[PDB]
């Protein structure tokens, strides 16, 4: 297949009748890429990898030799598109050719004029910088001069399409994120650049905002904030502006479709809320309102990042209040009021029940600072409520095993803070842990991570008390093995045999360190 079309694709470049040869070349490229993507056999797959990146013929040679010719722009586009796919199907096994590809992308960006060709080149370069995060190749990617070039592009070029300003800004951020050692001396300027452009796009009183530029600048700022922390501890000038812009980008403005600015803004929030902290207590009411209403937005990708942002927000405010939970007791009262109001509310939104109870458990910590007894009231209210619903309520006549991980995480969070365990709810707590080990298969994937985290957090919680409770770990593990070994092995549900639990323990006893 390949190298039959690849040679023909080379010879179409010298053939007369350009823009007629270009159509044949585009078809050759499409068929070749389609053959390459679908082949899954490491021998043939490696042969195709070598042929595609050949030095005499091959895709990159065609791209560099068809670069002073408008007729082939589509072909170039296609090739770059295909490579973004091929780099995804592949992995670090593009590493030998990476620098080659990198150069090609750069060259295209500086010689092709169509944004429909600049965009795929920048996308491929971003995905290269993302694939080889930590590798020997990063020093070979001349990151310093790459930044010099693209940061020149921000000034020494006038009015790019803004579908390429988005990518340029995002790439400038990614340069700070990956291989930051070579960005050390030029990140400050980059920060200014972001703080410049963002400002315009969000504070112009004369011009309609460029949403793609906003998304790109927020993504780049998010990447840059790794390795280059701008905390209120040492930077109470820049960090406050970062927070103001994120707040503007996530708050409910006029009803906007094309959810790309709120999404990136609150992803930045979810990743760096700790970085800008003091501002986070100065807006807790409005922040909580906005984050909640975003969590219910029903958009498949906005809801996910909104939930992550809410988690980080609650975690950060709990940590901040816990340090000084005496003059922030108003905020404690507010958050307990809100969580209780959610719980008392008869909704079918299990998501908001989960976040409510988990924030309740999070704030259990600082509550013991003001009373030292409400922590004892919790883990009794919580244990009793959790026993009444996952331990006797409609053994199979319901579907509310969805919020068992959140309840169990809440219990783990609570009991870490109280001394003198009430010693009579120990059996019921053991029973909850055993049953969630039992109900691991019943969950969907990406919902199995959260319950393993819940189980391990419980295990860590009651392993730090004393040997007397460390015996409960022995009993609960023994019971879980009893349950999963006692299963038959050769509007409908399924039945687990033993397989569904493997990853469970594979996560518990090996893969907590990167998770705990």
């Amino acid at each position: 297949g390949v190298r039959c079309s690849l040679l023909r694709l080379q010879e179409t470049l010298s053939a007369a009748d350009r823009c007629g040869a270009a159509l044949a070349g585009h078809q050759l490229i499409r068929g070749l890429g389609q053959e390459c993507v679908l082949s899954s056999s490491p021998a043939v797959l490696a042969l195709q990898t070598s042929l595609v990146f050949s030095r005499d013929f091959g895709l990159l040679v065609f791209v560099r030799k068809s670069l002073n010719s408008i007729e082939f722009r589509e072909c170039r586009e296609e090739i770059l598109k295909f490579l973004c796919i091929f780099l995804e199907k592949m992995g670090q096994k593009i590493a030998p050719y990476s620098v080659e590809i990198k150069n090609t992308c750069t060259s295209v960006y500086t010689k092709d004029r169509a944004a429909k060709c600049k965009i795929p080149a920048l996308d491929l370069l971003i995905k290269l910088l993302q694939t080889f995060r930590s590798s020997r190749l990063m020093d070979e990617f001349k990151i310093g001069e790459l930044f010099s070039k693209f940061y020149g592009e921000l000034a020494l070029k006038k009015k790019i399409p803004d579908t390429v300003l988005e990518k340029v800004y995002e790439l400038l951020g990614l340069l700070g994120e990956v291989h930051p050692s070579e960005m050390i001396n030029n990140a400050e300027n980059l920060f200014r650049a972001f703080l410049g452009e963002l400002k315009t796009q969000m504070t112009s009183a004369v011009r309609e905002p460029k949403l793609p530029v906003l998304a790109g600048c927020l993504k780049g700022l998010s990447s840059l904030l790794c390795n280059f922390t701008k905390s209120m501890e040492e930077d109470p000038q820049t960090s406050r502006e970062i927070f103001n812009f994120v707040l503007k980008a996530i708050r409910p403005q006029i009803d906007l479709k094309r959810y790309a600015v709120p999404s990136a803004g609150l992803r930045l929030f979810a990743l760096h809320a700790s970085q800008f902290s003091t501002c986070l207590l100065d807006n807790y009411v409005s922040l909580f309102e906005v984050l909640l209403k975003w969590c219910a937005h029903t958009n498949v990708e906005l809801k996910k990042a909104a939930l992550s942002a809410l988690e980080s927000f609650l975690k950060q405010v709990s940590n901040m209040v816990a340090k000084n939970a005496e003059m922030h007791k108003n905020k404690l009262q507010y958050f307990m009021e809100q969580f209780y109001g959610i719980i008392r509310n008869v909704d079918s939104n299990n998501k908001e029940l989960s976040i409510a109870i988990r924030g309740y458990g999070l704030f259990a910590g600082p509550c013991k600072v003001i009373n030292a007894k409400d922590v004892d009231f919790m883990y009794v209210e919580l244990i009793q409520r959790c026993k009444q619903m996952f331990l006797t309520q409609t053994d199979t006549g319901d579907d509310r095993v969805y919020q068992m991980p959140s309840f169990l995480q809440s219990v783990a969070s609570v009991l870490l803070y109280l001394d003198t365990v009430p010693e009579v709810y120990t059996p019921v707590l053991e029973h909850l842990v055993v049953m969630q080990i039992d109900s691991f298969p019943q969950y969907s994937p990406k919902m199995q991570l959260v319950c393993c985290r819940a189980i391990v957090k419980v295990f860590l919680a009651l392993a730090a008390k004393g040997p007397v409770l460390r015996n409960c770990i022995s009993t609960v593990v023994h019971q879980g093995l009893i349950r999963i070994c006692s299963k038959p092995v050769v509007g409908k549900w399924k039945v687990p045999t033993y397989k569904d639990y493997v990853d469970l323990f594979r996560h518990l006893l090996s893969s907590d360190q990167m998770m705990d």
């Binding site: 002073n68 060259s107 500086t110 010689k111 315009t200 796009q201 969000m202 504070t203 112009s204 009183a205 004369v206 011009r207 309609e208 905002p209 503007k248 980008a249 403005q253 006029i254 906007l256």
Partner: protein, 329 residues
């Protein structure tokens, strides 16, 4: 204090008589009249340019803008201004031979001129073809004003008729020659000859527009006709009064100043006095200056409502121009 703000009356006999442009009417090649063209009604622009000064030091000399012409090589292999010749798009290609060549072979105007190309009797020169950016008025030359009486005779021969003059006018050697019309005029304090440019054949454009008279989809109902008649009468801006049996000019837009430079002046003043305060609002006398008096609006609401409720559905509105400042607050 109402009209003094409304008009430029507060400025008077301060601005000098602008400029006399000396030339000569040439009819054929024998008659010649020594003439002084005074530039007249003409678009006005602010005479100061916002200067780019770098922030946090406010110094113009602290920044220099450069302009390099590199190349389209794999790297930006710069070339020098001495290595650059201007070309011209001709079909699908670009023609070299930049500047000295076209300096040699460019059209030469043979100096300034105000020669006459003949005369046009009727409304062959109708105002929708005036094409200039300025309007000149030619009077005369003094110092044995034979020229002045000759041009008075010419003006009276032009205006006692409906006749007008087509003129070949050129400012100087370098100026591109132009062809225009020469109005007779009717003034008693003075008598001029008013000149406006006039299109070349590759200037004017033929566009085809579907007719409205012979339209059945958009035939207007006579109720609509009389509603519009009522609106027009209720919204008139001219009147006959003071027992003179002549028409007056209410709301003379030809008298108020340009609000652009006035509001710029006030903004500069405010930012000079109060460097921290933000943009001021637009003065209310400015808005009152750019609006018809209240009586016409009061006369107009009722016919306006008649047309609103009587003409067909003013239906489709799906557009917006929301600003960043208002979309993020």
């Amino acid at each position: 204090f109402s009209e003094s703000l409304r008009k430029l009356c507060v400025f008077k006999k301060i601005e000098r008589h602008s400029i006399h442009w000396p030339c000569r009417l040439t009819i054929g090649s024998n008659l010649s009249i020594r003439i002084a063209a005074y530039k007249s009604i003409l678009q006005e622009r602010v005479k100061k340019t916002w200067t780019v000064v770098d922030a946090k030091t406010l110094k113009k000399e602290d920044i220099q803008k450069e302009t390099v012409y590199c190349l389209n090589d794999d790297d930006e292999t710069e070339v020098l201004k001495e290595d650059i010749i201007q070309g011209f798009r001709y079909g699908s290609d670009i023609v070299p031979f930049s500047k000295v060549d076209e300096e040699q072979m460019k059209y030469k105007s043979e100096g300034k001129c105000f020669s006459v190309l003949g005369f046009c009797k009727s409304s062959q020169v109708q105002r929708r073809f005036f094409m200039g950016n300025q309007v000149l008025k030619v009077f005369a030359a003094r110092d044995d004003e034979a020229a002045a009486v000759a041009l008075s005779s010419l003006i009276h021969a032009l205006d006692d008729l409906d006749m007008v003059a087509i003129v070949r006018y050129a400012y100087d050697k370098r100026a591109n020659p132009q062809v225009g019309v020469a109005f007779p005029h009717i003034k008693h304090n003075y008598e001029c000859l008013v000149y406006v440019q006039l299109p070349f054949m590759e200037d004017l454009r033929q566009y085809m527009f579907s007719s409205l008279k012979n339209s059945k989809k958009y035939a207007p109902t006579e109720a609509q006709l009389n509603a519009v008649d009522a609106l027009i009468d209720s919204m008139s801006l001219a009147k006959k009064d003071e027992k003179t049996d002549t028409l007056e000019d209410l709301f003379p837009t030809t008298k108020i100043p340009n609000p652009r430079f006035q509001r710029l002046f006030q903004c500069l003043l405010h930012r000079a006095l109060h460097p921290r305060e933000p943009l001021p609002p637009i003065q209310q006398h400015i808005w009152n200056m750019l609006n018809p008096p209240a009586e016409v609006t009061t006369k107009s609401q009722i016919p306006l409502s008649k047309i609103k409720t009587l003409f067909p559905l003013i239906e489709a509105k799906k557009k917006d121009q929301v600003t960043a400042q208002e979309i993020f607050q």
